[PDB]
Design an enzyme around this catalytic site. Structure first.
Site, short mmCIF file in Angstrom:
data_model
loop_
_atom_site.label_atom_id
_atom_site.label_comp_id
_atom_site.label_asym_id
_atom_site.label_seq_id
_atom_site.Cartn_x
_atom_site.Cartn_y
_atom_site.Cartn_z
N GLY A 25 0.74 -0.98 -0.52
CA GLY A 25 -0.05 0.66 0.02
C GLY A 25 1.05 1.42 -0.19
O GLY A 25 1.90 1.42 0.24
N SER A 26 0.91 2.09 -0.31
CA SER A 26 1.14 3.62 -0.06
C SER A 26 -0.07 4.53 -0.42
O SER A 26 -1.42 4.23 -0.71
CB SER A 26 2.27 4.31 -1.18
OG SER A 26 1.59 3.83 -2.38
N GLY A 30 1.37 6.32 4.73
CA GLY A 30 2.72 5.59 4.09
C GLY A 30 3.27 5.27 3.20
O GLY A 30 1.33 4.47 2.74
N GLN A 31 4.03 4.82 2.66
CA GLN A 31 4.29 3.22 1.28
C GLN A 31 4.38 2.71 2.91
O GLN A 31 5.22 2.45 3.80
CB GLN A 31 5.44 3.84 1.25
CG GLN A 31 6.05 3.38 -0.26
CD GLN A 31 6.96 3.95 -0.90
OE1 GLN A 31 8.34 4.63 0.05
NE2 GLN A 31 7.73 3.78 -2.05
N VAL A 32 3.35 1.29 2.51
CA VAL A 32 4.42 -0.23 3.14
C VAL A 32 4.87 -1.63 2.47
O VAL A 32 3.90 -1.74 0.90
CB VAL A 32 2.26 -0.52 3.63
CG1 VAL A 32 3.13 -1.41 4.41
CG2 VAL A 32 2.18 0.30 4.28
N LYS A 47 6.35 -0.63 6.97
CA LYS A 47 5.72 1.11 6.73
C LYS A 47 7.25 1.79 6.75
O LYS A 47 7.37 1.69 7.73
CB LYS A 47 4.22 1.74 8.03
CG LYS A 47 3.76 2.99 6.96
CD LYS A 47 3.22 3.50 8.04
CE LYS A 47 2.34 2.74 7.54
NZ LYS A 47 1.23 3.05 8.00
N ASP A 141 -12.79 6.33 9.65
CA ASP A 141 -13.15 5.65 8.77
C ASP A 141 -12.43 3.52 8.31
O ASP A 141 -11.76 2.82 6.93
CB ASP A 141 -11.15 6.30 8.11
CG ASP A 141 -11.42 6.18 6.37
OD1 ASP A 141 -12.68 6.40 5.62
OD2 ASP A 141 -10.28 6.18 6.30
#
Length: 265
Positions: A25-26, A30-32, A47, A141
Site C-alpha cells: 500500500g501507499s 505512508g508506503q507499506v 511502513k 474510517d
C-alpha cells in the site's frame, strides 16, 4: 525501537537485515512494503515514514502507530514488532496480512458469503469496542480497504491515521457490510462527497436486499448499524449481544480455506 519483539521474544535487527519485496500500500498513511529477513526468509510488513515526507501524511502515520503500540493486547488489530529510526526515515515493522477486504471483493467479482462476513463483523466490532473502551479512540474510517485478512483465517482492523480521541463508526461498518454482501458500494454513482452526504441524510438507509438468502440476524444487524437517529443506534456493548455476533462468535467457519480459494482466482 531498533530491535523487534515477536512471539514475546526480542530479536536484534536493523533495516539492512531486510530485503524489499515491493509495495503493498501507499498514499494515505505512508508506503507499506512487504519485506523479508535476508537470513531466514520470514516475511513482515514495513511502513516507511520519510523525514522529508508530506507533513500531514507523517502526522497520520504517527497517530496510527500510536494506536497500534497501545493496542498490543487486542488480537483484532495488526501488531507492531518494533521500529527502526534512521537519520532520514522511520521503518515500522508489523505483522503481514494477506490482503484487504476490498481486494477480496474485486477478486471475487461479486458478493462475499454471509458466513465470512459474520466472522468479519465479530472481529471488527471487537476491535472498535476495544479501541473505544480501553483507549477512548474512534476510528473514523471503517471500510473494506481497512479490513485485513490472511491465509490463516484471521481478520484485523488497520489504519488509524485519522482516528480521533473522545456514532458513525457503526454506520461505516453497516455500509461496508452492505458493500461486501452485495458486491456493490451503495453510494456507487455519487459523483461527489457532498452528494453522498445528501443521500445519507435524505434517503432511507441502504439495507441488505430481501431476496438474496441473508439471515434475519444479518439483516437485523445491518439495520441496527444503519440507524440514522443516534439515540437509536446501539452501543458496541449492545451490538456484541446481537444474535448475529453471538452466532459467529461460536460458529465454525473455514475462513482460511475460503481466503486461499479466492486468492487463487
Amino acid at each position: 525501537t531498533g530491535y523487534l519483539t515477536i512471539g514475546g521474544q526480542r530479536y536484534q535487527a536493523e533495516i539492512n537485515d531486510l530485503e524489499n519485496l515491493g509495495e503493498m500500500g501507499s498514499g494515505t498513511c505512508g508506503q507499506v512494503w512487504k519485506m523479508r529477513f535476508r537470513k531466514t526468509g520470514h516475511v513482515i510488513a514495513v511502513k516507511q515514514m520519510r523525514r522529508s515526507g508530506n507533513k500531514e501524511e507523517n502526522k497520520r502515520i504517527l497517530m496510527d502507530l500510536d494506536v497500534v503500540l497501545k493496542s498490543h493486547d487486542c488480537p483484532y488489530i495488526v501488531q507492531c514488532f518494533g521500529t527502526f529510526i534512521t537519520n532520514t526515515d522511520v521503518f515500522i515493522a508489523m505483522e503481514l496480512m494477506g490482503t484487504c477486504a476490498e481486494k477480496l471483493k474485486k477478486r471475487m467479482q461479486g458478493p462475499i458469503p454471509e458466513r465470512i462476513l459474520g466472522k468479519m463483523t465479530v472481529a471488527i466490532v471487537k476491535a472498535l469496542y476495544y479501541l473505544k473502551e480501553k483507549h477512548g479512540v474512534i476510528h473514523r474510517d471503517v471500510k473494506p480497504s481497512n479490513i485485513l485478512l490472511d491465509e490463516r483465517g484471521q481478520i484485523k482492523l488497520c489504519d488509524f491515521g485519522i482516528s480521533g480521541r473522545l456514532r458513525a463508526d457503526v454506520w461505516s461498518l453497516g455500509i461496508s457490510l452492505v458493500e461486501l454482501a452485495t458486491g456493490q458500494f451503495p453510494y456507487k454513482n455519487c459523483k461527489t462527497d457532498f452528494e453522498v452526504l445528501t443521500k445519507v441524510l435524505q434517503e432511507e438507509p441502504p439495507l441488505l436486499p430481501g431476496h438474496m438468502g441473508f439471515s434475519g440476524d444479518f439483516q437485523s444487524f445491518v439495520k441496527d448499524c444503519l440507524t440514522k437517529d443516534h439515540r437509536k443506534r446501539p452501543k458496541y456493548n449492545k451490538l456484541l449481544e446481537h444474535s448475529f455476533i453471538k452466532r459467529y462468535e461460536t460458529l465454525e467457519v473455514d475462513v482460511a480455506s475460503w481466503f486461499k480459494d479466492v486468492m487463487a482466482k
